[PDB]
């Protein structure tokens, strides 16, 4: 909301760099795998450079870009949250299953999404959030019909607009939906976030229904796991052929992946390149693969989304 100049950006770099030094601790021994924070902050920084070189003379215009302002203040806020995480977590950060480590990886995810959103609104370093092309024409029309050229809307605005098209029963359901769309956790929905969401739970025609069936009330939905997290969780059910899970990828946003346990004692992953995830699940259930969501006997019915 408040305006960005170069001084505040340099402060932002120094804060990120501080987090980087903290995460270079050998005793942390941090993961190779995305979201790998020690690549995300360097990469975020360098894309910020590519923006600064484009708006090299035009710095005053950029400090007023509502998206850029919101992003820089949230980036500030996230990196601060993280430094303070190291300070209160303290030595518990070098034990891997400690909850501080969980939160550290959660914010690693957020940093990752943030980077993809920045590269998405600033492709090649120059703002294109007014000309962002939502992949779904049904959703594209909603976005422009309710907000027009805007790149980022406050959450209560987006709540109201969407509520007229796809109503929401409770603030409970609202807060879960919020959890899903707002990948950057700043109380604003961007055109990028919105695109991604509207790709996961298409059709537009039954957006929130699809979201409730696949995310809210499905024991097989895993949010963001990694490949080896998928199999590491399904390693518990080798004895149970046909136990299955599906996940979101932080490297392939707007996409689904599935993993299940075969009758040969293997754990294999598949992607529904063509088929909305509910159809891929339906087919794979009849096909005898997705029987046991998360190793559980009752598998939800996804007919009635057709």
């Amino acid at each position: 909301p408040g305006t960005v100049d170069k001084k505040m950006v340099e402060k932002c770099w120094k804060l990120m760099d501080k987090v980087v030094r903290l995460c270079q601790n050998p005793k942390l021994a941090l993961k190779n795998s995305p979201p790998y924070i020690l690549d995300l902050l360097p990469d975020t920084y360098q894309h910020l450079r590519t923006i600064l070189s484009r708006y090299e003379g035009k710095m005053e215009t950029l400090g007023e870009n509502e998206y850029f302002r919101v992003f820089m203040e949230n980036l500030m806020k996230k990196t601060k949250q993280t430094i303070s995480l190291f300070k209160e977590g303290k030595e518990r950060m070098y034990e891997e299953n400690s909850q501080p480590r969980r939160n550290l990886t959660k914010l690693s995810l957020i940093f990752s999404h943030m980077l993809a959103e920045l590269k998405g609104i600033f492709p090649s370093g120059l703002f294109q959030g007014d000309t962002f092309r939502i992949t779904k024409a049904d959703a594209a029309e909603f976005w422009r019909k309710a907000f027009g050229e805007k790149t980022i809307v406050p959450w209560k605005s987006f709540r109201q607009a969407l509520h007229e098209v796809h109503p929401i029963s409770s603030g409970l359901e609202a807060m879960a939906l919020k959890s899903t769309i707002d990948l950057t956790c700043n109380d604003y929905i961007s055109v990028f976030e919105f695109d991604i969401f509207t790709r996961l739970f298409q059709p537009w025609s039954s957006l929130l229904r699809n979201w409730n069936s696949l995310a809210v009330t499905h024991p097989g939905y895993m949010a963001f796991l990694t490949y080896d997290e998928v199999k590491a969780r399904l390693q518990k059910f080798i004895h149970k052929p046909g136990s299955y899970i599906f996940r979101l990828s932080c490297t392939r946003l707007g996409q689904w992946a599935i993993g299940y346990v075969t009758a040969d004692g293997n754990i294999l992953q598949t992607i529904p390149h063509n088929k909305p995830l509910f159809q891929a699940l339906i087919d794979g259930f009849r096909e005898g693969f997705y029987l046991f969501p998360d190793g559980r006997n009752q598998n939800p019915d996804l007919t009635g989304l057709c």
Binding site: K77, K80, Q81, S84, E88, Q99, S170, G171, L172, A174, M175, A176, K178, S179, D187
Partner: protein, 94 residues
């Protein structure tokens, strides 16, 4: 007037409790939930943390017939560190 605004137990067991609170109109980054036998000291809680995107929590290991005091704190990050709103607490006999 606290945050959360209303706290209740919804499922019960001699050793377990299921608690739920409102969804806020304010921003919560995380909730800190505490519990312990009422009229005891702080050395005897036992606290844990839940996202601000959640409305429910499960507490286990409580010996039955004992009066517990349960508190939810709501924490928002500021430029300093996490700060809290007013808290809400209920007393529950298993």
């Amino acid at each position: 007037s606290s945050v959360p605004t209303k706290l209740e137990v919804v499922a019960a067991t001699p050793t377990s409790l299921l608690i739920s609170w409102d969804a806020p109109a304010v921003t919560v980054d995380f909730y800190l939930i505490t519990y312990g036998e009422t009229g005891a000291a702080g050395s005897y809680f036992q606290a844990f943390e839940v996202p601000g995107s959640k409305s429910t929590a499960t507490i286990s290991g409580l010996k039955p017939g004992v009066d517990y005091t349960i508190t939810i704190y709501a924490e928002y990050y500021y430029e300093d560190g996490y700060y809290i709103y007013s808290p809400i607490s209920i007393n529950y006999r298993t």
